[PDB]
């Protein structure tokens, strides 16, 4: 039933450690963002790797807080209001 | 060496030089680097003990970042100490909420 | 280049975070949040680089910028 | 421009904001 | 060439002291070096702030001990202070 | 008792202008069903295809405000009618009748998958949003034209929007020409700016992250409207906006018991203005140098 | 103005301080600063609790909202 | 003289006032005890550091600067009492 | 213009900031314009805060700035 | 004992900004705490940069980039402009 493959994926992804974003899209996004502060900037590959690790760790922690909020509201589906509430309670918004 | 005199494996001269060149104080007493080296050695010994236990638990003979992450997040005192650090290739602890489990 | 963060990737990140069901606006919300985070971090890194009088962004700049935010990262030369 | 003359200008617009608010209460 | 220092050999010696039949990857050795540097920086910053609060020009073992007490949690701080005192007395007793 | 008997809708004798595949809020039946909206000589008619008896007739004379909200950052396009007199739709009395159509569409055909297909889906979604916004905007203009100048079409100023809690959820409140609105989530907020007597900013004090905004109406029988948990970063913007709209405001560190205050004001409105009126909201009128420093 | 009574708070502070070192003295400004910090902290916590309670479509704050707030803040 | 169980000096109306300043309209009865425990854990964490500073200065009186440093260590910087 | 504040058109003390930067154990050496730059920034920020604090005290019909207005 | 505080300087700045306004003693305590805190932040970040770049001197560039890191956009721009103006005129004089 719906949610069985969801739990299979949850088990599979809490076991592995490999990066879940494709490398080239993230590099292109980083360069697009950086191009708005100074043109002709270069990035060591390790800088992009560190940025990707930090961004995924941040997003996973945020999704954990969002899941906590969603379960608090007695639901199962995470919603944008859950994200906004988590970011407000953290002190980010 | 000064590590031998204190029965230590970490360097006393290196730590004294880093304290001297780090713009911490005008002068540095001789009992500070020994004490600090002992603390660092104790903490790394604890970390490596739990990480070796975690790696044997997975039946591996070499410690990877995953075992460091498991050892840190599994020990209450260490996890409180390293509460803000993220470990590359450390992953997350397996944790499924009670209400999401199937029925 | 913000479209490159596809819906399956956000789904994967939510599954490693233990999320069972996902709304349809979560993807845009997450893209906005990630953009804000990356904007701040890259701005700090580029500040460090300009101060060091460089044209290349090193891993040390990223590590110091994360230490500046409080997001200390191990394993990149810190 | 230098900032002190803009904060003086912005705050004189804020004195007009307060004057309008006083006229509205009266 | 570039002769840059690290703690890898000391971490390896400590590992073989605690776990003889266990190795360590290079990425974990990097993480442990970063961890050691971080903890050093925290302790030295606390010691500096304490010295400046108390109007002293010297970082002694008292500052290090009280910074350890401030930073680490109860049992961990207790064991660390025990270790540090033991090492300091053993080093001071000899010469 | 408060349901005024309305005139009967006069059907257009030719081919009426129509908008297809529209949802209505509040729904006349528990089942959500798509309907068709028709323009007639003295109003609009919503008509469900499943049952003829679920018609909703709205006269132009009874519409107070007509809003169009485009689908730009939202997943739905909206045509909202705020009413002068409340209508009975099914079992619910309502001042608000919303017509909307969700663009939310599932696009991935779960042959190959890769960055070209996703970009094509995102482009197709943008084309669908723009088409629906053009269709609904045109139809809302055709409603305003059919009213013979009784109804202006209002569009919200998104750039002047602020976040707040009028009911139980945090929502984006959007100013229009003549009203402060929230139309996305039920219950709807529609505050007409001309009906406001005074605005009070509660919990404006050093060290709080959020303040509350209270609207008092010229009709003292109408309950006050609270917008709670507004970010303090928006305070100076809200004060400016209230000034630009000619609404007086006051600020206070404490939340007031408006339910007691409005009963005192209702008991004798004349004595209230005789004393000084709304001046008591300006904290304490000491009018003296504090001189706390010794 | 501070909401917790000053002398009960002083007694609480002394009682808590009685564990870490026997027979300590306190400056008055120390107790005042402690009370200001404690009340600011509690007000922020009640703000977060109110946010959670409103999120749950309620108006009453319950202990699980406090627990969720302290969890998200990262409090132990 | 030893102080015994003075946590109940945080009266129920005081917690209610703190909640009203926080914007809380209706309060459950288990909150008051919850809050009390929370406050205890807070003060024990701040005082343990303030005392640590006081003892390190080889003093016997807890000064305002000790509290200020203890708060500053937790990211709780306080203006008004020195700094 | 004897005082270094006058030579820079400032109100904050350049000499005290210089002494605190030196007798503060921050770095082996200190420039000549770092104290000037920092004093300028500090004076600007205090003016920025005092403008809004004066505005808030004038909106409450008060002549004295108190912690409430800050 | 001669205790040092920024009180007279805050009076000077206030009279420059609001000639007909006064400050309480507690507000002056808060302002002194604020000034000390900002000085500590900036000096610590300047030292951190100097050590990061293997330097043993704090020049106006380190202070400028510290202000760039700490202050937000408009605040950073105005404070940088003010500081460069003051340093330029002190050098010229």
From TrEMBL, chain F:
Residues 162-252 form the Histone chaperone RTT106/FACT complex subunit SPT16-like middle domain. Coiled coil: none annotated. It is found in: Nucleus; Chromosome. Component of the FACT complex. Belongs to the peptidase M24 family. SPT16 subfamily. Component of the FACT complex, a general chromatin factor that acts to reorganize nucleosomes. The FACT complex is involved in multiple processes that require DNA as a template such as mRNA elongation, DNA replication and DNA repair. During transcription elongation the FACT complex acts as a histone chaperone that both destabilizes and restores nucleosomal structure. This is FACT complex subunit. The chain holds residues 653 to 953 of 1005 of the full protein.
